[PDB]
Ligand SMILES: *[C@@](O)(c1nc2ccccc2s1)[C@H](CCCNC(=N)N)NC(=O)[C@H](CC(C)C)NC(=O)Cc1cccc(CNC(C)=O)c1
Ligand SMILES: [Cl-]
C-alpha cells in the first residue's frame with residue numbers, strides 16, 4: 001500500500017498473509033468462514049521454477065500485524081488443502097481474477113481473527129464510495145514491502161473513466177478504485193487482499209480483491225480490483241458460505 005498508514009492491532013481481523021516456498025509474504029487473502037479464504041487466482045500460478053499452484057507450499061497467517069512478529073499472541077498459522085480458481089480466470093487478460101483457498105484446519109475465531117461479510121449479488125459499490133485497502137505490499141512502486149500491515153482509504157472510480165484510462169484492459173469483472181490524482185493505492189504484495197467497505201449501518205462488506213495496476217499510486221492509473229458481488233453464488237456453490 002502506497003500513501004497509507006500503519007493499521008492498528010486487530011483492526012482488520014479478516015486480512016490474511018500468504019507465504020510460500022520460504023519466500024515470506026507473497027499475497028494477501030481474506031477470511032470468509034472458519035475454513036475458507038478469498039484471494040486472487042493470479043497468485044497461485046507456477047512461475048520461474050516455483051510451484052505456486054501447489055497448495056501444500058503455502059502457509060496462511062491469520063491475526064498477523066507485523067511480518068517480523070509471526071509468533072505474537074493471537075497469530076494463527078494454517079496450511080492450505082486446496083486452491084479453487086474461478087473457471088473463467090485466465091492469465092492473459094486476468095479476467096475473473098478470484099480464487100477460494102481451503103484451510104487444512106479451521107481458523108479459531110477471536111478478536112484478532114474473524115471473517116468479513118460477503119455482499120449480495122445485487123449490491124453495487126457506486127462511484128465515489130469510500131473503501132479501505134490493506135496489505136503488506138510495497139509502499140512505493142519498485143520499493144519494498146511493509147513489516148506492519150498498512151491501510152489506506154480510496155474511492156470507487158467511474159467505470160467509463162476506468163475503461164478509458166486503461167484502454168483494452170478493463171472488463172466488467174474489474175473496478176478501478178483509488179484517486180485520479182494518485183497518491184494512495186495498493187501495490188505489489190497486496191494482491192489477493194480485500195477491499196473493506198463500511199456501509200451505511202456500520203457493517204463492513206468485502207468490496208473486491210486486489211488485482212493489478214499500471215505502476216502504483218500514479219495519476220490517472222488507479223488500482224484495478226476484481227468485483228465481488230458478481231461472485232456471491234459461485235462462492236456459495238463451492239464453499240457453502
Ligand atoms: C499483487 O500484489 C501481486 N501479484 C503477484 C503475482 C505473482 C507473484 C507475486 C505477486 S504480488 C500485485 C498488486 C498490484 C496492484 N497495483 C496497483 N493497485 N497499482 N499485482 C501485480 O503485480 C500484477 C500481477 C499480474 C499477474 C496480474 N501485475 C500488475 O499489476 C502489472 C500490470 C498488469 C496488467 C496490466 C498492466 C498495465 N501495463 C501496460 C503497459 O499497459 C500492469
Ligand atoms: Cl466453512
Ligand SMILES: [Cl-]
Nearest residue numbers: 078079104105
Ligand atoms: Cl493447518
Ligand SMILES: [Cl-]
Nearest residue numbers: 124125227229
Ligand atoms: Cl460492485
Ligand SMILES: [Cl-]
Nearest residue numbers: 127157158161
Ligand atoms: Cl471518478
Ligand SMILES: [Cl-]
Nearest residue numbers: 180181219220
Ligand atoms: Cl492529467
